[PDB]
Write a protein that binds this DNA or RNA. Sequence first.
DNA 1: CCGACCGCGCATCAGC
DNA 2: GCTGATGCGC
DNA 3: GTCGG
Length: 325
Amino acid sequence: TLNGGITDMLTELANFEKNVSQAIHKYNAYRKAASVIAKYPHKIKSGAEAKKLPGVGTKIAEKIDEFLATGKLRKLEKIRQDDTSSSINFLTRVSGIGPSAARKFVDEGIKTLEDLRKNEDKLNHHQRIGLKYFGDFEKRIPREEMLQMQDIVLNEVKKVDSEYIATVCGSFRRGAESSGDMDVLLTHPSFTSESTKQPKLLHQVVEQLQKVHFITDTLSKGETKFMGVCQLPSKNDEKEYPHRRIDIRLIPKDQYYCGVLYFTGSDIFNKNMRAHALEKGFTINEYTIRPLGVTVAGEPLPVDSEKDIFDYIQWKYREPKDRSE
DNA sequence: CCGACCGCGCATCAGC
DNA sequence: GCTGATGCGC
DNA sequence: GTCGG
Ligand SMILES: Nc1nc2c(ncn2[C@H]2C[C@H](O)[C@@H](COP(=O)(O)CP(=O)(O)OP(=O)(O)O)O2)c(=O)[nH]1
Ligand SMILES: [Mg+2]
Ligand SMILES: [Mg+2]
Ligand code: NA
């Protein structure tokens, strides 16, 4: 972390803008700047130097000059000292509680973990589970446990139908030594962009995983996306493993490459890549890459590899391990 | 200067 | 109920 | 908050 100090600062500012100011573009501006600085291979010596980077403008440059000269940022010192901002920032740490709900809770006099616990009936289902596992969800997942989890999911999916393919993406596929959660891409020959020849495809998999007590709770669930909680089994006399977040995304089998590009991320990498696509006259989602007409997105382009997608927008291919922005 | 900023699934709500 | 908008999250 | 045109 050559510039850990600066990137932390920008990240703290990003979170402030998202959670407190509810300014989504400032939030992303800060994340963009943090990311570009995080990959810059020199220890930054000044704001002017940082300003040379795409995404770092005049304001951030000044903040970087303040931070290098003093080791802190007055703007942040004050924010940390503001009861309301501190409260809202904390509440948003609960899964299911965002900027709006957080601010609403604070108004109603609900602003601590203790408050939340005694006002459970004021929470929706997602929020209840978020609170339930508040502690566990901030723990990291060692890659070693991710491997065990991978083994379980893949074998259980196989048990439901040998035709399922399950791929663990997210930070895990990018080779991270630890992950915030597990992200599982699912495909089945019966679900393509052309038809759904079989119902309950995602359901049957969730069911099986619940049946074996791997999945423990559900945050949300539709036909193509599951968001919930899972837990590795422990051994006799062993303390239990923390509960873990798990996301499962069912994607049409014929759109696997756009799907896996999406789910592999990182989020900022996708954002940057999609932004570039627009500049090259394409739009990219998790299903397709389409050209943009003189006016509207056109018809989907043939894609037979992740690299094919990079080719269209004229980027040299980047391995998953190099997409951690 | 200033419009535009990546793209979308599920849960909830308002209005009809 | 439906549709569209918003919140929250990937 | 930043930036392309
Ligand atoms: N285009 C796009 N893709 C996204 C976004 N957010 C997530 N993805 C894609 C890319 C992302 O890789 C994948 C999973 O997102 P997470 O599981 O929440 C964060 P991960 O990268 O997995 O790292 P972890 O902190 O869990 O160790 O969804 C977004 O805002 N936009
Ligand atoms: Mg993840
Ligand atoms: Mg995830
Ligand atoms: Na939250």
